[PDB]
Assembly symmetry: D2
Homo-oligomer: 421 residues x 4
Amino acid sequence: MDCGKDYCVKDLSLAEEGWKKIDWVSRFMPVLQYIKREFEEKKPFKGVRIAATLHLEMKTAFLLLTLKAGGAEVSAAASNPLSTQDDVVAALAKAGVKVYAIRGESREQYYEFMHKALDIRPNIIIDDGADMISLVHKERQEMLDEIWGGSEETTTGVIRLRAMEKAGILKFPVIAVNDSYMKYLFDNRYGTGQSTWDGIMRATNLLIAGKNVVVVGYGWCGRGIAMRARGLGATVIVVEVDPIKALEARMDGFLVMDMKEAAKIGDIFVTATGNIKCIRREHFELMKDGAIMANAGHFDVEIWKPDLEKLAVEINNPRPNVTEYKLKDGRRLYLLADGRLVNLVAADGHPAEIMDMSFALQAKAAEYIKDNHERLEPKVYILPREIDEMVARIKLESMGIKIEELTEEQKKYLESWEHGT
Amino acid sequence: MDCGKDYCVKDLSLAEEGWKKIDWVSRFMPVLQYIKREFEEKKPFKGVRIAATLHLEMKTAFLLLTLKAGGAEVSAAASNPLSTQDDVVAALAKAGVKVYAIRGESREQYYEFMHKALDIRPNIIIDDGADMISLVHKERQEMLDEIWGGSEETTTGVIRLRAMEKAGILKFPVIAVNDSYMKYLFDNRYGTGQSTWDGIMRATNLLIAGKNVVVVGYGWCGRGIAMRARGLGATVIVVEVDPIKALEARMDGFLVMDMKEAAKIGDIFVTATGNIKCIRREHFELMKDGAIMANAGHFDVEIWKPDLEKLAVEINNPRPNVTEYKLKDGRRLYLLADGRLVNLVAADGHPAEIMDMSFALQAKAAEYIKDNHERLEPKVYILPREIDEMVARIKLESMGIKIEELTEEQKKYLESWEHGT
Amino acid sequence: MDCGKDYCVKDLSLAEEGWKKIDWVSRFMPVLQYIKREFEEKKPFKGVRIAATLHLEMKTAFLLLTLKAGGAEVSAAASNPLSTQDDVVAALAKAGVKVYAIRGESREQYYEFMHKALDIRPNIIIDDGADMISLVHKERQEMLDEIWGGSEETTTGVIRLRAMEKAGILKFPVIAVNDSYMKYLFDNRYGTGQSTWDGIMRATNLLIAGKNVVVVGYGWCGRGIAMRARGLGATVIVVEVDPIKALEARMDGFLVMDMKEAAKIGDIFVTATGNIKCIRREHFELMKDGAIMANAGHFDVEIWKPDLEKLAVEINNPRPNVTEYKLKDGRRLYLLADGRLVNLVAADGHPAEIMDMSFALQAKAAEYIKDNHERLEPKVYILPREIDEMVARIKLESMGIKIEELTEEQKKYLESWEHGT
Amino acid sequence: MDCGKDYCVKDLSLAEEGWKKIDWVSRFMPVLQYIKREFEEKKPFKGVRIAATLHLEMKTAFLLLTLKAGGAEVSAAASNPLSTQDDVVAALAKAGVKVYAIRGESREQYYEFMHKALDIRPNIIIDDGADMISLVHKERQEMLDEIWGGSEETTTGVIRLRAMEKAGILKFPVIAVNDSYMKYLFDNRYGTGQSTWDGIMRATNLLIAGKNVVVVGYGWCGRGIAMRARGLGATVIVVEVDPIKALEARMDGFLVMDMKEAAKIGDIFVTATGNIKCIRREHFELMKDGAIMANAGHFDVEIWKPDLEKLAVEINNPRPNVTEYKLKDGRRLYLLADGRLVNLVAADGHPAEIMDMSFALQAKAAEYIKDNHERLEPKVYILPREIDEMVARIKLESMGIKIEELTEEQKKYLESWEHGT
Ligand SMILES: NC(=O)c1ccc[n+]([C@@H]2O[C@H](COP(=O)([O-])OP(=O)(O)OC[C@H]3O[C@@H](n4cnc5c(N)ncnc54)[C@H](O)[C@@H]3O)[C@@H](O)[C@H]2O)c1
Ligand SMILES: NC(=O)c1ccc[n+]([C@@H]2O[C@H](COP(=O)([O-])OP(=O)(O)OC[C@H]3O[C@@H](n4cnc5c(N)ncnc54)[C@H](O)[C@@H]3O)[C@@H](O)[C@H]2O)c1
Ligand SMILES: NC(=O)c1ccc[n+]([C@@H]2O[C@H](COP(=O)([O-])OP(=O)(O)OC[C@H]3O[C@@H](n4cnc5c(N)ncnc54)[C@H](O)[C@@H]3O)[C@@H](O)[C@H]2O)c1
Ligand SMILES: NC(=O)c1ccc[n+]([C@@H]2O[C@H](COP(=O)([O-])OP(=O)(O)OC[C@H]3O[C@@H](n4cnc5c(N)ncnc54)[C@H](O)[C@@H]3O)[C@@H](O)[C@H]2O)c1
Ligand SMILES: O=c1[nH]cnc2c1ncn2[C@@H]1O[C@H](CO)[C@@H](O)[C@H]1O
Ligand SMILES: O=c1[nH]cnc2c1ncn2[C@@H]1O[C@H](CO)[C@@H](O)[C@H]1O
Ligand SMILES: O=c1[nH]cnc2c1ncn2[C@@H]1O[C@H](CO)[C@@H](O)[C@H]1O
Ligand SMILES: O=c1[nH]cnc2c1ncn2[C@@H]1O[C@H](CO)[C@@H](O)[C@H]1O
């Protein structure tokens, strides 16, 4: 309703509560605070314009204000129509961030707002899922030479960007922030493990313990979801298409079976494949009455909703973020968060300390593009490992943890080859 | 304020949303559904009057409607001023339950409303914390002879009632529902373990993994909170006064230390003692900046608020359910949910499937008083174990689990002595 | 071969290695060391004669030498023909303990040696499984009036003694050492959890992780076996006849099914029921090729060997403590330790620190009978809880652990009833 | 000493018991059985000569017999003097494998025997630790041109060989078997995790629950040892020099601290660094009386023995595989297995099912060298991932596990970029 040239938000008067959310989580993001203190002294982004597509909650807002405190002019659009937190977005507009996002946006508004954030003519694109980078190449080619580079936050976006590189139609360098150690080993695994179950408990008020929990995919996200489910008392069943990862899951104490077999016995289904149609018609037909389904991957195509809609004679909404599909035989299957990332739609996303480390890497990626975009080709690059090591050492210092250091004798010993028995 | 002779609630128009919540959780309470079916067929509480003091959310409402469906006239009052959900109690008033409760109500309203609930002149009293049973004994002795018996839901209430029995002031029989196997082994341990971290994550959006979590008390709630804290990645420290339970915690993999030593290193403190002043001035003086404190016990006297108030130079409110106490040296200590039951005040309480089991026991305890009050004494009794076994068997059938049965040969072997080596 | 009036052992020349085993574990039994220091100063067992039936390994030997250091004259027979460690027993004979035990004893030698230990005419009988107490009543009635009392170490023996009491034919008081908190919460649960898997790994050199482990019984032993199996990476399936314990196992994250269903899928079967014929013919007929079976209960009647012998066309012994039953269709099923307690026959029994606490209670039980046998009836008694608390406090002191103490205000608060909201 | 031109073993009569052990573990090695079947049908190593340096127990023997069954002439030498099992190597000599190994052999015999194994003039060298590959390069250059290539089994050996490649002294290609997915993710983590505690329990008979377990190194072995220590009830502390891995350990629930601080509080220390002098004088000076030390790394230089010797006033041997170092103040520190690979020297090594996977990779690496040596360079290569996938798929079939397969639609989606929101 408060919609103009410089922003489009639901209600500017929600800003006071948004500021409190941003201030609260920033108390627990020491790595990004450390970087912000530097950005304020050196203003490395003076004159630089930055367009961002991220999940617009209070940790994201602190990243954007950090970039703004480094002197950047910043625009923002939502990365998912339903992950936007309206009060936080109101606070970003009052701060001078050109943010275009209303929670519950239509698909068309999603793209209209993404285009409005692009109007800033960014030198740097910060993206989560690669929609903005894809949109620039497909509908806004008039500004590619202005773009120094982009960065991509999540696995599904990195896969899209690499296919763009393979097809030769990527036109500027992108940093695969998702591919950094301090990202996928912590965000994808520990962050999703906690916040997926946070979201599922919040939407349902159901018991995890003594449930058959079916985790589809045992990559970084899935093994984190499986680890925390087990930690909450569930019997965990893992579905994989990779035989090495299936054996890993067995060795971790989990049942491994295929999707039809898992569909007969699961109580709670969570998808984390990054793929399309992992759960479709013939799986829904086998599910027990009252089964709960949730998706943790980036796009809502992992649980195939049109198959659910075709099976159902009634579609009801008994709770916020719970869609009920009632089948011909009377069975009711429940889909959480409309099949979209359950941690960000039913809850508050990853915890503050996790996003601290991811978004610290995003800030260093943006600084990396600024400094090196002339040396880079239109390809997908990974940040140098020294940036991972810097982030880890700042985190450990803020926890009061001191680790052993290699002695010079040890350094020589590991580089040598004559010291056998 | 919508308050007639029959009810007193915040806002009757909220009732539609309370019904949805009640309908939702009831789909996942099979044991109580099974009991509700029989109560509707046989009407065993026809002409019986029941007054309840419970935490007034969804699952409590389904219990109260189950009793009413069995013929009972039911009155209800809050067990904690801040656990009440205003939309659920609006639905209960519309349904004919004489409920007197407003979220946030004053202590004076808490007791005024408890008296209004008692105006029904009950035959059975269902209590959570033993205030209502204590109130009849202190201010409403004119209806003691009408009361068949009471039932107590929680560990703190059972302790009070056995102290009343030891003192000779208990005037009618009391069923200690908390002492049933199907209660304290499931509700107190598995329920509290999950819902305590539900509430803490909900209030703070902070990471549990890699935190020092201090759990005070290693009784049934304490070991549940510890089990799930560990399941979520935390390093757990247990503080106990019972030496056997301290050893149990060690063997279970936890650090054990006293409260001063734990105060210096904890990031998150959770009390589960049912005692007074477990965490007090000298502990607050030792905690790290940004320590987070939560109480899982029934009364908010475990973390001693007045000592935080005396220590503080400012008291701020950065989030819902987060009080900030700022000390002279700039440290900020955070108290969740005002030091009250964090699972019920910052979240939705125990999961539906847990309360299904607890409240099935409450329904049966009410039936047990109806059928046995004429041959019970003014003492504290425990439900016969056949009822625990019935609740467990109904729950197992609803899960599709079929267990082995003792053969006659095995029963005779277990009662013999001549079959050694 | 070295067999006389005062002892019967395999080889006296093994004593030097037995002494080393006894000295080693005694370094890690501080509670029994504490008690031994007292026994040496007060000699409370001067003139007292003690007959013991225990598993004759090096922790048991230290208990017996502790009793001897208190001035007791001590005899000993094995509690299982196959748990005796010949070198330890040689060391006991050189110390003056009248020990009659050879590893691999026949059933008849087992009883002939048990009778020889009885020839001491004991005032106190220390028993594990209740064979000696049963033998005295059935074949050695000429010495009952000399016997002050007995104590019983394990669950299966306590069940036998209580049936003896119910039949009115128990003739002296017995202490149910197994029923003490510091016994079944630690020995039965944590001790058996570790040492069962110790024994199974040692006999087989097989991988626990990624196996279907079927635990029969979820009492104290079974839940300890299940907990450690899961900790070693196994998928754990629990078989129970108690619906409450079955639900507990579900809530702990384990699969629960009946024995036929478990027999089709288990890779490793462990029995811990204390019952007869939990695994019999129609379970063996469903087992996968190469299934491994082990028993942790006291008697070898839990896995019904005669059904295995009838099914097999060849019975082979591919490894020590592995019996191979080859079936008509070519399947091979492996029974460990001849179906006898796998932790004590395939390995070294419970770890030293666990037996420290159990055998400390056994020493205090013997001292309890000495001091109170005149006040006691021919019944089964449990040690007073103060002895449990003493043992726990000595253990905690030896670990360097200090616990919180209740303040006087807290003591009053927990005994009060007027402090509600 | 039974030593001809063709073998040198302790005692040929032990062979019957070695065969039983070999036959036993082979029943549980399905992947290697599958490969053995093909090797016998196709005889791909006919006329090929193979020299191996491995830990000579049962599973190693089945690998060597598998190679021989494929037509190979096989020689073998010990990878560690104290990991050799004299009965197994007796069976290998009887079978025609030219094995030169005695348990406890001197360092001079270790190298003499390695030279005897090399007297076969091998075409393929299979190594564990890279001594044999290092020995050919330093003392036996007269057969470098006959050698097709070598394979390295372990992390320490791969480090040495890549240092030889970086220095230009490597003269023939080398397969880093340790770097295969089906190796380091299973062998190094799950295998070492189980067999390290197998060996420690076997040597000490002490309780793991409620101990402070210090794990030095959080690589693949270290995190396996930590995972299973926690699974057995211990409080685990990780010591690392890598800051990312330190953070991983925290998030996994473990305390992280440096080695001096961990030295003061550990009860059990386990090194898994592959480095030198991780635990040294100043740490021994800080440890508690009765601390137990064990090494899981390939060379016994992680716990620095000479510093214990200088600190000690007595060195005693209270148990097999337990050295006692008594210090001036009476403290006794215990070193297990002489500081060598505790799983192999104090127990039976990794479980059969783990070595099945590792040694299946060795068999295929030997086949890979046979088929590709004419187009490889003097470099360190990793086996193609198709072989890892083949090993994992054979293992899954033998477990009865059927996993889902990527549809063609899913493969095309994973390679597209236009399908966003
Ligand atoms: N906050 C969040 O919810 C969050 C955080 C990080 C990543 N993600 C999203 O999660 C998804 C994956 O994250 P990752 O980092 O785990 O990817 P990853 O590639 O490590 O794991 C993907 C796994 O899915 C498996 N898989 C693919 N199709 C499958 C199928 N049909 N059945 C079973 N298994 C299948 C693959 O074998 C692979 O192991 C992506 O969409 C990523 O964007 C979400
Ligand atoms: N939040 C919920 O929904 C929920 C659920 C069940 C019970 N409860 C409440 O939780 C509390 C405990 O329930 P329980 O069933 O665990 O009781 P319990 O007696 O099982 O456990 C209490 C433990 O606290 C220990 N303790 C007492 N004072 C202590 C101190 N000063 N320092 C350290 N340890 C101390 C005691 O030794 C005892 O082991 C009660 O108030 C009960 O009503 C709350
Ligand atoms: N060192 C050891 O190996 C060791 C240590 C302590 C006790 N024990 C022995 O272990 C056995 C039990 O020990 P406890 O203390 O666990 O007994 P417990 O009674 O706590 O557990 C016994 C369980 O077995 C279950 N059960 C009985 N028959 C069953 C059946 N047919 N199928 C499935 N479950 C069945 C019962 O429901 C009960 O829960 C006894 O024989 C005891 O002597 C051995
Ligand atoms: N016992 C077995 O059967 C077995 C099995 C596999 C590997 N290994 C041996 O175990 C060792 C490690 O194997 P990996 O595969 O774990 O190696 P790796 O490199 O995965 O892990 C080594 C870790 O040690 C850490 N580290 C190095 N020096 C350290 C120090 N001074 N203090 C603390 N941490 C330190 C490094 O940071 C690294 O993370 C190697 O020697 C390998 O050959 C033994
Ligand atoms: O609370 C959050 N704020 C911002 N980004 C988040 C939060 N939680 C997860 N992600 C990010 O969302 C991506 C999936 O689209 C993941 O890569 C994750 O890093
Ligand atoms: O969601 C809930 N509804 C009703 N009661 C609850 C819920 N969660 C916990 N308790 C109950 O509160 C008592 C402590 O005062 C506990 O006994 C528990 O059974
Ligand atoms: O190492 C040991 N020494 C002596 N007794 C033991 C050991 N391990 C277990 N038990 C005891 O054996 C009983 C079963 O018959 C159990 O009660 C246990 O306490
Ligand atoms: O039982 C075994 N037999 C043969 N090799 C083994 C066994 N257990 C571990 N290793 C191997 O020893 C190497 C360290 O030197 C590890 O790489 C591991 O694969």
